[PDB]
Design an enzyme around this catalytic site. Structure first.
Site, mmCIF file in Angstrom:
data_model
loop_
_atom_site.group_PDB
_atom_site.id
_atom_site.type_symbol
_atom_site.label_atom_id
_atom_site.label_comp_id
_atom_site.label_asym_id
_atom_site.label_seq_id
_atom_site.Cartn_x
_atom_site.Cartn_y
_atom_site.Cartn_z
ATOM 1 N N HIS A 39 4.760 -10.561 2.495
ATOM 2 C CA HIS A 39 4.095 -10.586 3.809
ATOM 3 C C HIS A 39 2.595 -10.916 3.757
ATOM 4 C CE1 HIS A 39 3.198 -6.075 3.421
ATOM 5 N NE2 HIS A 39 2.023 -6.624 3.673
ATOM 6 N N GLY A 141 -3.878 2.334 3.622
ATOM 7 C CA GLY A 141 -4.688 1.154 3.321
ATOM 8 C C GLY A 141 -4.401 0.552 1.954
ATOM 9 N N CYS A 143 -2.003 -0.938 0.409
ATOM 10 C CA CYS A 143 -0.855 -1.847 0.374
ATOM 11 C C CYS A 143 -0.750 -2.633 -0.935
ATOM 12 C CB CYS A 143 -0.902 -2.809 1.560
ATOM 13 S SG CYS A 143 0.525 -3.899 1.660
#
Length: 297
Positions: A39, A141, A143
């Site tokens: 993504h 946060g 990721c």
């Protein structure tokens, strides 16, 4: 109150950052392959309804920037493996350990190396919930952070961070890019049944308060597993079994307070408000920390 900040370990040198468009998330640099959630290649609009096979077509090697501190790793190839984006770089990580990839299950404790703005901020202990999500503020946060187990000489990577859900719970994949649970890498409403509060943790955290000053919520009431579970079902708390009371054994012994009388404390904490009062410098009852995290005093 926090989980213990374990040293970054062997995985520290494996952490890189990958940038596509205007998105930057963490990656895992093993040999001459960088792995990161696919993504990354999406804009905000793409994320609404993405065809990942078509979006990658509109990308090249130069679409990606791989950052190892202040060092660039030139991208010489890109492919997709499930929900993982695979990046071929022109040098191999000299710190690549002896590693294998494996899929784990809920309950199994594994180590997660956190990252603030792509900067390894110590390893954290954790496990996936029965619904395959992770409770851990340290992943907010962060990721692209990977989960692992270091067994002897071997590093077994089992998890990678993909999604933060609006319920403050985290979805991810194994290192093949296959999601744990029913989750997907396209932001929709997928948080159903993911926000029901874990009772065992709240109690454990309440025990953490008792042997640390805070005592105001202690009551002179009695409740059974039965009468508490009716309260638990009303306020969307997980039904408490006998196994959980058995877990809180040594915790009840150190404090001297009975488990069911600690539930009576929780019952009134749930039925009444909290008046802006504080339990361990917090206004909300926390369920992020397992009883094993409280075995750290």
């Amino acid at each position: 109150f926090r989980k213990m900040a374990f040293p970054s370990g062997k995985v520290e040198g494996c952490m890189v950052q990958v940038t596509c468009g205007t998105t930057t998330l963490n990656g895992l640099w093993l040999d001459d392959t960088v792995y990161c959630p696919r993504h990354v290649i999406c804009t905000a609009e793409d994320m609404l309804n993405p065809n990942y096979e078509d979006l990658l077509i509109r990308k090249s090697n130069h679409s990606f920037l791989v950052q190892a501190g202040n060092v660039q790793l030139r991208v010489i190839g890109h492919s997709m493996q499930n929900c993982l984006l695979r990046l071929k770089v022109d040098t191999s990580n000299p710190k690549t350990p002896k590693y294998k990839f494996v899929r784990i299950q809920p309950g199994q404790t594994f180590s997660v190396l956190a990252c603030y703005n792509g900067s390894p901020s110590g390893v954290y202990q954790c496990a996936m919930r029965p619904n395959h999500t992770i409770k851990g503020a340290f992943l907010n946060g962060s990721c692209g952070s990977v989960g692992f187990n270091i067994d002897y000489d071997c590093v077994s990577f089992c998890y990678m961070h993909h999604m933060e859900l609006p319920t403050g719970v985290h979805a991810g994949t194994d290192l093949e890019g296959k999601f744990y649970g029913p989750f997907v890498d396209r932001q929709t409403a997928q948080a159903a049944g993911t926000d029901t509060t874990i009772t065992l943790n709240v109690l454990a955290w309440l025990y953490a308060a008792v042997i640390n000053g805070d005592r105001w919520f202690l009551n002179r009431f009695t409740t059974t597993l039965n009468d508490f579970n009716l309260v638990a079902m009303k306020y969307n708390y997980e039904p408490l079994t006998q196994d959980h009371v058995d877990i809180l054994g040594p915790l009840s012994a150190q404090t001297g307070i009975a488990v069911l009388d600690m539930c009576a404390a929780l019952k009134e904490l749930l039925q009444n408000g909290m008046n802006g009062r504080t339990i361990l410098g917090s206004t909300i009852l926390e369920d992020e920390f397992t009883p094993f995290d409280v075995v750290r005093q």
